[PDB]
Amino acid sequence: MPPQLHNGLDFSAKVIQGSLDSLPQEVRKFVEGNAQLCQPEYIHICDGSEEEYGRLLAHMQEEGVIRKLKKYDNCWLALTDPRDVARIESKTVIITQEQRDTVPIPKSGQSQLGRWMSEEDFEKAFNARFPGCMKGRTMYVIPFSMGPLGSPLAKIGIELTDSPYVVASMRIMTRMGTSVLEALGDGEFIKCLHSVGCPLPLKKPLVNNWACNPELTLIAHLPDRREIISFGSGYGGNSLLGKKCFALRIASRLAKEEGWLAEHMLILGITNPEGKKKYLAAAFPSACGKTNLAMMNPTLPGWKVECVGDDIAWMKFDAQGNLRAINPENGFFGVAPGTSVKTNPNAIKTIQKNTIFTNVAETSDGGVYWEGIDEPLAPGVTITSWKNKEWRPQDEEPCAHPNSRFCTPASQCPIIDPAWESPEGVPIEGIIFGGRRPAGVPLVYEALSWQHGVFVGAAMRSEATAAAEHKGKVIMHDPFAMRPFFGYNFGKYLAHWLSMAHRPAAKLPKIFHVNWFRKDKNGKFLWPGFGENSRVLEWMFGRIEGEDSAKLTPIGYVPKEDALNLKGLGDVNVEELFGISKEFWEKEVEEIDKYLEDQVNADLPYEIERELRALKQRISQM
Ligand SMILES: [Mn+2]
Ligand code: NA
16 A cells, blocks of 8 residues: 555565455554554554464463463463563653643642653654664554443554563453454544564563563653553553553543543442442542452342442443443453452452463462462462562562452453443442541541532542552552543643533432541551441442431531441441541641642632632531
8 A cells, every 4th residue: 555665664564464455544554654663573463363362372371471370261470570560650641732731730840640741852752762662573453442342432442562461461451353443444543552662682681581671661642643652561551551541541631622531430330138229430549449349249138239340430421411431441450469259259250260460479280379369278389479489478578569460351250240331331320539548537428519529539648559659658649549540630620520510410429438448546457348348338329319327527428326237347446437536637638738739729620729628617617
Protein backbone atom coordinates (compact mmCIF):
# COMPACT_ATOMS: atom_id res chain seq x y z
CA MET A 1 0.00 0.00 0.00
CA PRO A 2 2.42 2.75 1.06
CA PRO A 3 4.18 4.72 -1.68
CA GLN A 4 8.00 4.67 -1.58
CA LEU A 5 10.99 5.56 -3.76
CA HIS A 6 12.99 2.69 -2.26
CA ASN A 7 12.19 -0.36 -0.07
CA GLY A 8 12.12 0.72 3.59
CA LEU A 9 8.57 1.96 4.18
CA ASP A 10 6.49 -1.12 3.29
CA PHE A 11 6.86 -3.68 6.12
CA SER A 12 4.78 -6.41 4.39
CA ALA A 13 7.83 -8.72 4.09
CA LYS A 14 8.43 -8.71 7.88
CA VAL A 15 4.89 -9.82 8.76
CA ILE A 16 4.99 -13.26 10.42
CA GLN A 17 1.27 -13.53 11.22
CA GLY A 18 -1.71 -11.86 9.57
CA SER A 19 -1.56 -9.30 6.79
CA LEU A 20 -1.04 -5.54 6.54
CA ASP A 21 -3.32 -5.77 3.49
CA SER A 22 -6.18 -7.20 5.57
CA LEU A 23 -5.85 -4.47 8.22
CA PRO A 24 -8.15 -1.43 8.28
CA GLN A 25 -6.48 1.58 6.61
CA GLU A 26 -5.74 3.54 9.79
CA VAL A 27 -4.54 0.40 11.61
CA ARG A 28 -2.02 -0.34 8.83
CA LYS A 29 -0.68 3.25 8.98
CA PHE A 30 -0.40 3.08 12.78
CA VAL A 31 1.48 -0.27 12.71
CA GLU A 32 3.69 0.61 9.71
CA GLY A 33 4.52 4.16 10.89
CA ASN A 34 5.72 2.79 14.22
CA ALA A 35 7.50 -0.13 12.54
CA GLN A 36 9.43 2.49 10.53
CA LEU A 37 10.36 4.21 13.82
CA CYS A 38 11.09 1.27 16.14
CA GLN A 39 12.61 -0.94 13.41
CA PRO A 40 11.33 -4.32 14.65
CA GLU A 41 12.70 -7.43 12.97
CA TYR A 42 9.19 -8.93 12.64
CA ILE A 43 5.53 -8.00 12.92
CA HIS A 44 3.06 -10.43 14.48
CA ILE A 45 -0.61 -9.48 14.14
CA CYS A 46 -2.26 -11.19 17.13
CA ASP A 47 -5.30 -13.35 16.43
CA GLY A 48 -6.24 -14.10 20.06
CA SER A 49 -6.32 -17.89 19.49
CA GLU A 50 -5.51 -20.53 22.11
CA GLU A 51 -2.91 -21.91 19.68
CA GLU A 52 -1.21 -18.49 19.50
CA TYR A 53 -1.31 -18.22 23.31
CA GLY A 54 0.19 -21.64 24.15
CA ARG A 55 2.93 -21.31 21.52
CA LEU A 56 3.96 -17.89 22.85
CA LEU A 57 4.05 -19.19 26.44
CA ALA A 58 6.11 -22.19 25.29
CA HIS A 59 8.50 -19.78 23.51
CA MET A 60 8.87 -17.61 26.61
CA GLN A 61 9.53 -20.82 28.58
CA GLU A 62 12.31 -22.04 26.26
CA GLU A 63 13.81 -18.53 26.41
CA GLY A 64 13.88 -18.50 30.23
CA VAL A 65 11.46 -15.54 30.36
CA ILE A 66 8.77 -17.57 32.21
CA ARG A 67 8.40 -20.92 33.98
CA LYS A 68 5.50 -23.37 33.86
CA LEU A 69 3.93 -24.10 37.23
CA LYS A 70 3.68 -27.89 37.14
CA LYS A 71 1.16 -28.29 39.98
CA TYR A 72 -1.59 -26.41 38.09
CA ASP A 73 -3.54 -26.39 34.80
CA ASN A 74 -1.88 -24.00 32.29
CA CYS A 75 -0.33 -21.70 34.94
CA TRP A 76 2.89 -19.72 34.58
CA LEU A 77 5.38 -17.69 36.62
CA ALA A 78 7.42 -14.62 35.62
CA LEU A 79 10.17 -13.07 37.75
CA THR A 80 11.06 -9.47 36.96
CA ASP A 81 14.13 -7.28 37.33
CA PRO A 82 13.79 -5.85 40.89
CA ARG A 83 13.83 -2.34 39.31
CA ASP A 84 10.56 -3.04 37.43
CA VAL A 85 8.04 -4.17 40.09
CA ALA A 86 5.20 -1.60 40.30
CA ARG A 87 3.71 1.58 38.84
CA ILE A 88 5.91 4.70 38.95
CA GLU A 89 3.71 7.76 39.41
CA SER A 90 6.63 10.19 39.03
CA LYS A 91 7.30 8.87 35.50
CA THR A 92 3.63 8.82 34.49
CA VAL A 93 2.80 11.95 32.49
CA ILE A 94 -0.10 13.51 30.56
CA ILE A 95 0.50 15.84 27.62
CA THR A 96 -1.73 18.85 27.01
CA GLN A 97 -1.25 22.33 25.54
CA GLU A 98 -2.08 23.94 28.90
CA GLN A 99 -0.91 22.43 32.20
CA ARG A 100 -4.17 23.47 33.88
CA ASP A 101 -6.19 21.11 31.64
CA THR A 102 -4.18 18.23 33.15
CA VAL A 103 -3.77 19.30 36.80
CA PRO A 104 -4.91 22.23 38.93
CA ILE A 105 -2.02 24.66 39.46
CA PRO A 106 -0.86 24.00 43.02
CA LYS A 107 -0.24 27.02 45.25
CA SER A 108 2.84 25.25 46.65
CA GLY A 109 4.12 24.48 43.13
CA GLN A 110 4.23 20.69 43.38
CA SER A 111 1.10 18.83 42.27
CA GLN A 112 -0.05 15.73 44.10
CA LEU A 113 -2.81 15.26 41.49
CA GLY A 114 -0.96 14.17 38.36
CA ARG A 115 2.09 14.98 36.26
CA TRP A 116 2.11 17.29 33.24
CA MET A 117 4.64 17.43 30.44
CA SER A 118 4.61 19.90 27.55
CA GLU A 119 4.28 18.54 24.00
CA GLU A 120 7.74 20.05 23.27
CA ASP A 121 9.30 18.15 26.19
CA PHE A 122 7.58 14.89 25.31
CA GLU A 123 8.80 15.00 21.70
CA LYS A 124 12.38 15.26 23.00
CA ALA A 125 11.78 12.40 25.48
CA PHE A 126 10.19 10.34 22.67
CA ASN A 127 13.02 10.91 20.15
CA ALA A 128 15.51 9.98 22.89
CA ARG A 129 13.81 6.60 23.44
CA PHE A 130 11.82 5.07 20.56
CA PRO A 131 13.93 5.34 17.38
CA GLY A 132 15.36 1.84 16.80
CA CYS A 133 14.07 0.53 20.17
CA MET A 134 12.65 -2.76 18.77
CA LYS A 135 15.72 -3.75 16.71
CA GLY A 136 16.04 -7.55 16.61
CA ARG A 137 12.61 -8.04 18.20
CA THR A 138 9.05 -8.86 17.17
CA MET A 139 6.46 -6.08 17.18
CA TYR A 140 3.19 -7.69 18.30
CA VAL A 141 -0.01 -5.94 17.22
CA ILE A 142 -2.73 -6.48 19.85
CA PRO A 143 -6.26 -5.57 18.78
CA PHE A 144 -8.19 -5.29 22.04
CA SER A 145 -11.65 -4.36 23.25
CA MET A 146 -12.43 -2.71 26.59
CA GLY A 147 -15.86 -3.86 27.70
CA PRO A 148 -17.97 -6.73 26.40
CA LEU A 149 -18.36 -6.69 22.60
CA GLY A 150 -21.74 -5.17 21.73
CA SER A 151 -21.74 -2.83 24.72
CA PRO A 152 -22.56 0.78 23.77
CA LEU A 153 -19.88 1.64 26.34
CA ALA A 154 -17.20 -0.59 24.72
CA LYS A 155 -14.01 0.94 23.27
CA ILE A 156 -11.35 -0.66 21.10
CA GLY A 157 -7.59 -0.13 21.02
CA ILE A 158 -4.50 -1.33 19.21
CA GLU A 159 -1.42 -2.01 21.34
CA LEU A 160 1.97 -2.38 19.70
CA THR A 161 4.50 -4.09 21.97
CA ASP A 162 7.86 -5.88 21.83
CA SER A 163 6.96 -7.95 24.94
CA PRO A 164 5.40 -11.47 24.67
CA TYR A 165 4.55 -11.12 28.40
CA VAL A 166 2.40 -8.10 27.54
CA VAL A 167 0.65 -10.11 24.78
CA ALA A 168 -0.20 -13.06 27.06
CA SER A 169 -1.47 -10.79 29.88
CA MET A 170 -3.50 -8.62 27.49
CA ARG A 171 -5.23 -11.81 26.32
CA ILE A 172 -6.40 -12.26 29.92
CA MET A 173 -7.14 -8.66 30.83
CA THR A 174 -8.92 -7.59 27.62
CA ARG A 175 -10.94 -9.18 24.82
CA MET A 176 -8.30 -9.55 22.12
CA GLY A 177 -7.78 -10.90 18.60
CA THR A 178 -9.21 -11.16 15.08
CA SER A 179 -12.89 -10.62 16.03
CA VAL A 180 -11.95 -7.23 17.53
CA LEU A 181 -10.37 -6.08 14.23
CA GLU A 182 -13.57 -7.22 12.49
CA ALA A 183 -15.69 -5.29 15.00
CA LEU A 184 -13.52 -2.17 14.57
CA GLY A 185 -13.69 -1.88 10.76
CA ASP A 186 -12.77 1.65 9.71
CA GLY A 187 -13.72 3.02 13.17
CA GLU A 188 -11.65 4.84 15.75
CA PHE A 189 -9.22 3.18 18.16
CA ILE A 190 -6.90 4.30 20.97
CA LYS A 191 -3.32 4.20 19.65
CA CYS A 192 -1.17 2.36 22.20
CA LEU A 193 2.58 1.95 21.80
CA HIS A 194 4.82 0.07 24.21
CA SER A 195 8.49 -0.93 24.30
CA VAL A 196 10.69 -2.50 27.00
CA GLY A 197 13.46 -0.23 25.67
CA CYS A 198 16.08 -2.91 25.06
CA PRO A 199 16.98 -3.08 21.34
CA LEU A 200 19.22 -5.97 20.31
CA PRO A 201 22.13 -6.38 20.63
CA LEU A 202 21.71 -5.52 24.32
CA LYS A 203 23.76 -2.50 25.41
CA LYS A 204 23.10 -3.15 29.10
CA PRO A 205 23.06 -6.42 31.14
CA LEU A 206 19.81 -8.41 31.30
CA VAL A 207 18.61 -9.11 34.85
CA ASN A 208 16.61 -12.29 35.52
CA ASN A 209 15.79 -12.49 31.77
CA TRP A 210 13.54 -9.43 32.08
CA ALA A 211 13.97 -6.71 29.45
CA CYS A 212 13.43 -3.23 30.91
CA ASN A 213 14.95 0.27 30.88
CA PRO A 214 14.38 1.75 34.37
CA GLU A 215 16.38 4.95 33.75
CA LEU A 216 14.27 5.79 30.68
CA THR A 217 10.90 4.52 31.97
CA LEU A 218 8.17 6.91 30.83
CA ILE A 219 4.42 6.26 30.71
CA ALA A 220 2.83 8.99 28.60
CA HIS A 221 -0.74 9.91 27.66
CA LEU A 222 -1.74 12.19 24.78
CA PRO A 223 -5.56 12.63 24.96
CA ASP A 224 -5.86 15.09 22.04
CA ARG A 225 -3.99 12.70 19.71
CA ARG A 226 -5.77 9.63 21.23
CA GLU A 227 -2.36 8.08 21.96
CA ILE A 228 -0.71 6.22 24.87
CA ILE A 229 3.07 5.84 24.71
CA SER A 230 4.93 3.75 27.29
CA PHE A 231 8.68 3.03 27.46
CA GLY A 232 11.06 0.99 29.68
CA SER A 233 8.70 -1.03 31.89
CA GLY A 234 7.06 -4.45 31.52
CA TYR A 235 5.04 -4.31 34.76
CA GLY A 236 1.24 -4.59 34.40
CA GLY A 237 0.12 -1.02 35.19
CA ASN A 238 2.86 0.44 32.97
CA SER A 239 2.62 -2.01 30.06
CA LEU A 240 -0.98 -3.29 29.87
CA LEU A 241 -2.11 -0.11 28.19
CA GLY A 242 -5.87 -0.78 28.11
CA LYS A 243 -6.03 -0.84 31.92
CA LYS A 244 -4.84 2.26 33.82
CA CYS A 245 -3.68 4.19 30.76
CA PHE A 246 -6.82 3.92 28.62
CA ALA A 247 -9.65 2.72 30.91
CA LEU A 248 -8.82 5.32 33.59
CA ARG A 249 -6.61 8.22 32.36
CA ILE A 250 -7.72 8.57 28.74
CA ALA A 251 -11.30 7.45 29.44
CA SER A 252 -11.94 9.75 32.43
CA ARG A 253 -11.24 12.73 30.16
CA LEU A 254 -13.48 11.32 27.42
CA ALA A 255 -16.08 10.62 30.12
CA LYS A 256 -16.09 14.25 31.24
CA GLU A 257 -16.44 15.39 27.61
CA GLU A 258 -19.27 12.94 26.86
CA GLY A 259 -21.22 12.86 30.15
CA TRP A 260 -20.25 9.51 31.71
CA LEU A 261 -17.66 8.39 34.33
CA ALA A 262 -14.56 6.19 34.35
CA GLU A 263 -13.57 5.23 37.86
CA HIS A 264 -11.21 3.19 40.00
CA MET A 265 -14.20 1.16 41.31
CA LEU A 266 -15.07 -2.49 41.82
CA ILE A 267 -18.62 -3.53 40.84
CA LEU A 268 -20.45 -6.24 42.82
CA GLY A 269 -23.98 -7.62 43.04
CA ILE A 270 -25.38 -8.44 46.48
CA THR A 271 -28.50 -10.50 47.25
CA ASN A 272 -30.25 -10.50 50.63
CA PRO A 273 -32.24 -13.28 52.43
CA GLU A 274 -35.46 -11.64 51.10
CA GLY A 275 -34.52 -12.34 47.45
CA LYS A 276 -33.52 -8.76 46.59
CA LYS A 277 -30.39 -7.96 44.59
CA LYS A 278 -28.56 -4.63 44.42
CA TYR A 279 -25.36 -3.58 42.64
CA LEU A 280 -22.72 -1.55 44.44
CA ALA A 281 -19.57 0.25 43.31
CA ALA A 282 -16.55 0.87 45.55
CA ALA A 283 -13.51 3.09 45.13
CA PHE A 284 -10.64 1.99 47.33
CA PRO A 285 -6.99 2.82 46.61
CA SER A 286 -4.64 0.21 45.14
CA ALA A 287 -4.07 -2.80 47.42
CA CYS A 288 -6.79 -1.73 49.88
CA GLY A 289 -9.22 -4.62 49.60
CA LYS A 290 -11.17 -4.12 46.36
CA THR A 291 -10.56 -7.65 45.06
CA ASN A 292 -11.46 -9.12 48.48
CA LEU A 293 -14.74 -7.16 48.56
CA ALA A 294 -15.64 -7.72 44.89
CA MET A 295 -15.64 -11.51 45.26
CA MET A 296 -16.37 -11.69 48.98
CA ASN A 297 -17.70 -14.83 50.64
CA PRO A 298 -20.38 -13.46 53.03
CA THR A 299 -20.40 -14.86 56.58
CA LEU A 300 -24.05 -13.85 57.02
CA PRO A 301 -26.43 -16.72 56.17
CA GLY A 302 -28.71 -16.13 53.17
CA TRP A 303 -26.54 -13.34 51.72
CA LYS A 304 -24.80 -13.75 48.36
CA VAL A 305 -22.14 -11.60 46.69
CA GLU A 306 -21.35 -11.87 42.95
CA CYS A 307 -18.49 -10.18 41.07
CA VAL A 308 -18.80 -7.87 38.04
CA GLY A 309 -15.28 -6.42 38.27
CA ASP A 310 -12.57 -5.68 40.83
CA ASP A 311 -10.81 -2.56 39.51
CA ILE A 312 -12.43 -0.30 36.92
CA ALA A 313 -15.99 0.87 36.22
CA TRP A 314 -17.39 2.75 33.23
CA MET A 315 -20.67 4.36 34.32
CA LYS A 316 -23.46 6.37 32.71
CA PHE A 317 -26.92 7.59 33.66
CA ASP A 318 -29.41 6.13 31.18
CA ALA A 319 -32.64 7.69 29.84
CA GLN A 320 -34.38 6.13 32.86
CA GLY A 321 -31.98 7.88 35.25
CA ASN A 322 -30.33 4.68 36.44
CA LEU A 323 -26.56 4.79 36.86
CA ARG A 324 -25.50 1.87 34.69
CA ALA A 325 -22.05 0.35 35.07
CA ILE A 326 -19.90 -2.02 33.03
CA ASN A 327 -16.59 -3.66 33.73
CA PRO A 328 -14.24 -2.71 30.82
CA GLU A 329 -11.78 -5.49 31.79
CA ASN A 330 -11.75 -9.23 30.97
CA GLY A 331 -9.66 -10.44 33.91
CA PHE A 332 -8.33 -9.68 37.39
CA PHE A 333 -4.82 -8.35 37.88
CA GLY A 334 -4.89 -8.90 41.64
CA VAL A 335 -2.33 -8.45 44.42
CA ALA A 336 -1.06 -11.90 45.48
CA PRO A 337 0.26 -11.63 49.09
CA GLY A 338 -2.53 -11.89 51.69
CA THR A 339 -4.64 -14.02 49.33
CA SER A 340 -5.80 -17.22 51.07
CA VAL A 341 -8.80 -19.50 51.69
CA LYS A 342 -9.36 -17.29 54.75
CA THR A 343 -9.23 -13.86 53.12
CA ASN A 344 -10.44 -14.62 49.57
CA PRO A 345 -11.59 -18.21 48.81
CA ASN A 346 -13.24 -17.28 45.48
CA ALA A 347 -9.94 -15.85 44.20
CA ILE A 348 -8.14 -19.05 45.22
CA LYS A 349 -10.58 -21.06 43.07
CA THR A 350 -10.09 -18.63 40.16
CA ILE A 351 -6.27 -18.66 40.00
CA GLN A 352 -5.76 -22.45 39.85
CA LYS A 353 -5.96 -22.48 36.04
CA ASN A 354 -4.99 -20.39 32.98
CA THR A 355 -3.33 -17.85 35.26
CA ILE A 356 -0.07 -15.90 34.97
CA PHE A 357 1.77 -15.15 38.20
CA THR A 358 4.42 -12.47 38.48
CA ASN A 359 7.01 -12.18 41.26
CA VAL A 360 5.55 -14.84 43.61
CA ALA A 361 7.50 -17.72 45.19
CA GLU A 362 7.64 -21.19 43.67
CA THR A 363 7.38 -24.42 45.65
CA SER A 364 9.40 -27.50 44.64
CA ASP A 365 6.28 -29.37 43.47
CA GLY A 366 5.54 -26.56 40.97
CA GLY A 367 3.04 -24.54 43.02
CA VAL A 368 2.83 -20.87 44.05
CA TYR A 369 3.63 -19.28 47.42
CA TRP A 370 3.37 -15.87 49.11
CA GLU A 371 3.11 -14.08 52.46
CA GLY A 372 -0.34 -14.68 53.96
CA ILE A 373 -1.22 -17.70 51.79
CA ASP A 374 -2.05 -19.53 55.06
CA GLU A 375 -1.40 -23.01 53.64
CA PRO A 376 1.26 -25.23 55.24
CA LEU A 377 3.46 -27.28 52.92
CA ALA A 378 4.30 -30.98 53.30
CA PRO A 379 7.72 -31.74 54.85
CA GLY A 380 10.33 -31.83 52.07
CA VAL A 381 8.64 -29.15 49.96
CA THR A 382 11.10 -26.30 49.42
CA ILE A 383 10.60 -22.68 48.31
CA THR A 384 12.28 -20.62 45.59
CA SER A 385 11.71 -16.91 46.19
CA TRP A 386 10.77 -14.24 43.62
CA LYS A 387 14.51 -13.45 43.47
CA ASN A 388 15.21 -17.01 42.19
CA LYS A 389 16.98 -18.06 45.41
CA GLU A 390 16.28 -20.79 47.97
CA TRP A 391 14.02 -19.30 50.64
CA ARG A 392 13.21 -20.31 54.22
CA PRO A 393 10.71 -18.70 56.68
CA GLN A 394 13.62 -17.25 58.73
CA ASP A 395 15.15 -15.31 55.79
CA GLU A 396 14.07 -11.82 57.01
CA GLU A 397 12.87 -10.81 53.52
CA PRO A 398 9.61 -12.02 51.91
CA CYS A 399 9.43 -15.04 49.58
CA ALA A 400 7.20 -12.97 47.28
CA HIS A 401 7.46 -9.32 46.26
CA PRO A 402 4.88 -7.20 48.16
CA ASN A 403 3.32 -6.09 44.84
CA SER A 404 3.43 -9.54 43.20
CA ARG A 405 0.41 -10.44 41.08
CA PHE A 406 -1.89 -12.97 39.58
CA CYS A 407 -3.41 -12.23 36.21
CA THR A 408 -6.49 -14.41 35.84
CA PRO A 409 -9.57 -14.82 33.55
CA ALA A 410 -12.71 -13.22 35.01
CA SER A 411 -14.93 -15.92 33.48
CA GLN A 412 -13.23 -18.39 35.89
CA CYS A 413 -14.43 -16.66 39.08
CA PRO A 414 -16.96 -19.09 40.62
CA ILE A 415 -19.20 -16.16 41.63
CA ILE A 416 -18.79 -14.08 38.47
CA ASP A 417 -22.05 -12.17 38.06
CA PRO A 418 -24.55 -13.41 35.42
CA ALA A 419 -24.65 -9.82 34.08
CA TRP A 420 -20.87 -9.07 34.12
CA GLU A 421 -20.87 -9.00 30.30
CA SER A 422 -24.32 -7.50 29.72
CA PRO A 423 -24.18 -4.68 27.09
CA GLU A 424 -26.52 -2.43 29.14
CA GLY A 425 -24.46 -2.57 32.35
CA VAL A 426 -25.82 -3.05 35.86
CA PRO A 427 -27.67 -0.40 37.91
CA ILE A 428 -25.53 1.03 40.73
CA GLU A 429 -27.52 1.86 43.84
CA GLY A 430 -24.66 2.62 46.21
CA ILE A 431 -21.14 3.98 45.93
CA ILE A 432 -18.57 3.22 48.62
CA PHE A 433 -15.42 5.17 49.43
CA GLY A 434 -12.68 4.00 51.77
CA GLY A 435 -9.01 3.49 52.54
CA ARG A 436 -6.53 2.46 55.19
CA ARG A 437 -6.93 4.73 58.21
CA PRO A 438 -5.36 3.30 61.41
CA ALA A 439 -7.10 5.95 63.55
CA GLY A 440 -10.14 8.24 63.88
CA VAL A 441 -12.36 7.11 60.96
CA PRO A 442 -15.30 4.86 62.06
CA LEU A 443 -16.18 1.52 60.44
CA VAL A 444 -18.95 2.96 58.23
CA TYR A 445 -20.73 6.21 57.60
CA GLU A 446 -23.19 7.55 55.08
CA ALA A 447 -22.98 10.90 53.28
CA LEU A 448 -25.65 13.53 54.01
CA SER A 449 -26.28 14.39 50.37
CA TRP A 450 -24.80 14.03 46.87
CA GLN A 451 -22.68 17.17 47.42
CA HIS A 452 -21.41 15.90 50.79
CA GLY A 453 -20.82 12.52 49.10
CA VAL A 454 -18.58 14.19 46.51
CA PHE A 455 -16.70 15.93 49.35
CA VAL A 456 -16.19 12.58 51.14
CA GLY A 457 -14.66 11.17 47.93
CA ALA A 458 -12.51 14.29 47.55
CA ALA A 459 -11.30 14.08 51.16
CA MET A 460 -10.18 10.42 50.99
CA ARG A 461 -6.86 9.61 52.67
CA SER A 462 -5.17 6.20 52.92
CA GLU A 463 -1.90 4.54 53.98
CA ALA A 464 0.73 4.24 51.23
CA THR A 465 0.86 0.73 49.71
CA ALA A 466 3.34 -1.26 47.56
CA ALA A 467 1.27 -0.64 44.36
CA ALA A 468 3.56 2.28 43.42
CA GLU A 469 6.86 3.91 44.52
CA HIS A 470 5.58 5.28 47.84
CA LYS A 471 7.27 3.66 50.84
CA GLY A 472 6.15 3.26 54.45
CA LYS A 473 2.54 3.55 55.60
CA VAL A 474 2.35 7.36 55.42
CA ILE A 475 -1.27 8.51 55.10
CA MET A 476 -1.61 10.20 51.71
CA HIS A 477 -4.47 11.92 49.97
CA ASP A 478 -6.19 9.72 47.38
CA PRO A 479 -9.41 11.45 46.28
CA PHE A 480 -11.92 8.98 44.77
CA ALA A 481 -9.00 6.48 44.79
CA MET A 482 -8.02 8.27 41.57
CA ARG A 483 -4.87 10.20 42.58
CA PRO A 484 -2.56 8.20 40.23
CA PHE A 485 -5.24 8.06 37.52
CA PHE A 486 -6.88 11.46 36.76
CA GLY A 487 -6.89 12.12 33.01
CA TYR A 488 -7.57 15.82 33.59
CA ASN A 489 -7.91 18.63 36.14
CA PHE A 490 -9.16 17.23 39.47
CA GLY A 491 -11.20 20.39 40.11
CA LYS A 492 -13.12 19.92 36.84
CA TYR A 493 -13.52 16.24 37.85
CA LEU A 494 -15.25 17.32 41.09
CA ALA A 495 -17.43 19.72 39.07
CA HIS A 496 -18.25 16.83 36.70
CA TRP A 497 -19.30 14.60 39.63
CA LEU A 498 -21.33 17.44 41.17
CA SER A 499 -23.13 18.09 37.85
CA MET A 500 -24.71 14.60 38.03
CA ALA A 501 -27.21 15.94 40.60
CA HIS A 502 -28.77 18.24 37.97
CA ARG A 503 -29.17 15.54 35.29
CA PRO A 504 -32.75 14.73 34.16
CA ALA A 505 -34.45 11.97 36.22
CA ALA A 506 -31.10 11.03 37.81
CA LYS A 507 -31.44 8.33 40.45
CA LEU A 508 -28.40 9.25 42.52
CA PRO A 509 -26.72 6.39 44.40
CA LYS A 510 -26.33 6.55 48.16
CA ILE A 511 -22.70 7.31 49.07
CA PHE A 512 -20.89 5.60 51.96
CA HIS A 513 -17.42 5.67 53.47
CA VAL A 514 -15.88 2.61 55.12
CA ASN A 515 -12.79 1.89 57.18
CA TRP A 516 -11.85 -1.81 57.42
CA PHE A 517 -8.42 -0.86 58.71
CA ARG A 518 -8.92 0.98 62.01
CA LYS A 519 -6.54 -0.12 64.78
CA ASP A 520 -6.56 0.32 68.57
CA LYS A 521 -3.88 1.80 70.86
CA ASN A 522 -1.43 -1.13 70.63
CA GLY A 523 -1.93 -1.49 66.86
CA LYS A 524 -4.49 -4.30 66.71
CA PHE A 525 -7.20 -4.30 64.00
CA LEU A 526 -10.59 -3.46 65.53
CA TRP A 527 -12.49 -5.21 62.75
CA PRO A 528 -12.16 -8.86 61.55
CA GLY A 529 -12.97 -7.84 57.95
CA PHE A 530 -13.11 -10.00 54.81
CA GLY A 531 -16.30 -12.11 54.93
CA GLU A 532 -17.50 -10.16 58.00
CA ASN A 533 -17.75 -7.02 55.83
CA SER A 534 -21.12 -8.45 54.71
CA ARG A 535 -22.46 -7.05 58.01
CA VAL A 536 -21.64 -3.51 56.78
CA LEU A 537 -23.02 -4.24 53.29
CA GLU A 538 -26.25 -5.42 54.98
CA TRP A 539 -26.62 -2.04 56.69
CA MET A 540 -25.94 -0.24 53.41
CA PHE A 541 -28.58 -2.42 51.69
CA GLY A 542 -31.26 -1.45 54.25
CA ARG A 543 -30.28 2.22 54.06
CA ILE A 544 -30.75 2.17 50.26
CA GLU A 545 -34.17 0.57 50.90
CA GLY A 546 -34.92 3.57 53.16
CA GLU A 547 -34.63 1.70 56.47
CA ASP A 548 -34.62 3.85 59.65
CA SER A 549 -31.29 2.41 60.82
CA ALA A 550 -29.17 5.59 60.95
CA LYS A 551 -28.07 8.15 63.55
CA LEU A 552 -26.83 11.65 62.63
CA THR A 553 -23.23 12.58 63.52
CA PRO A 554 -21.04 15.54 62.42
CA ILE A 555 -19.36 13.38 59.71
CA GLY A 556 -22.57 11.81 58.32
CA TYR A 557 -24.98 9.04 59.30
CA VAL A 558 -23.73 6.02 61.26
CA PRO A 559 -25.59 2.82 62.25
CA LYS A 560 -27.92 3.20 65.24
CA GLU A 561 -27.09 1.32 68.41
CA ASP A 562 -27.70 -2.40 67.73
CA ALA A 563 -28.52 -1.63 64.04
CA LEU A 564 -25.47 -3.55 62.82
CA ASN A 565 -25.64 -7.36 63.07
CA LEU A 566 -22.71 -8.40 65.28
CA LYS A 567 -23.91 -11.97 66.07
CA GLY A 568 -21.01 -14.45 66.14
CA LEU A 569 -18.47 -11.69 66.85
CA GLY A 570 -19.25 -10.42 70.38
CA ASP A 571 -15.72 -9.40 71.43
CA VAL A 572 -15.68 -6.43 68.99
CA ASN A 573 -14.75 -3.10 70.62
CA VAL A 574 -17.68 -0.98 69.43
CA GLU A 575 -16.69 1.97 71.63
CA GLU A 576 -13.52 2.81 69.69
CA LEU A 577 -14.46 1.23 66.33
CA PHE A 578 -17.45 3.57 65.96
CA GLY A 579 -15.95 6.38 68.10
CA ILE A 580 -15.79 9.95 66.79
CA SER A 581 -13.33 12.27 68.55
CA LYS A 582 -13.69 16.07 68.31
CA GLU A 583 -9.91 16.46 68.42
CA PHE A 584 -9.17 13.97 65.63
CA TRP A 585 -11.80 15.54 63.39
CA GLU A 586 -10.69 19.11 64.12
CA LYS A 587 -7.25 18.00 62.89
CA GLU A 588 -8.80 16.09 59.99
CA VAL A 589 -10.85 19.03 58.67
CA GLU A 590 -7.94 21.51 58.91
CA GLU A 591 -5.71 19.07 57.00
CA ILE A 592 -8.40 18.63 54.29
CA ASP A 593 -8.85 22.44 54.12
CA LYS A 594 -5.15 23.10 53.50
CA TYR A 595 -4.85 20.23 51.02
CA LEU A 596 -7.79 21.43 48.89
CA GLU A 597 -6.68 25.09 49.10
CA ASP A 598 -3.17 24.18 47.94
CA GLN A 599 -3.87 21.41 45.46
CA VAL A 600 -7.18 22.46 43.91
CA ASN A 601 -7.26 26.26 44.53
CA ALA A 602 -9.03 28.24 41.74
CA ASP A 603 -10.51 25.00 40.37
CA LEU A 604 -12.16 23.85 43.62
CA PRO A 605 -15.94 23.88 43.08
CA TYR A 606 -17.88 26.19 45.44
CA GLU A 607 -20.01 23.23 46.55
CA ILE A 608 -16.90 21.38 47.84
CA GLU A 609 -15.64 24.43 49.77
CA ARG A 610 -19.20 24.72 51.15
CA GLU A 611 -19.20 21.09 52.34
CA LEU A 612 -15.80 21.71 53.98
CA ARG A 613 -17.16 24.74 55.86
CA ALA A 614 -20.25 22.75 56.89
CA LEU A 615 -18.19 19.87 58.31
CA LYS A 616 -15.88 22.27 60.16
CA GLN A 617 -18.99 23.84 61.72
CA ARG A 618 -20.61 20.52 62.69
CA ILE A 619 -17.31 19.56 64.37
CA SER A 620 -16.99 22.94 66.17
CA GLN A 621 -20.40 22.28 67.76
CA MET A 622 -19.74 18.78 69.16
MN1 LIG B 1 -6.38 -0.70 40.60
NA1 NA C 1 12.56 -13.85 34.62
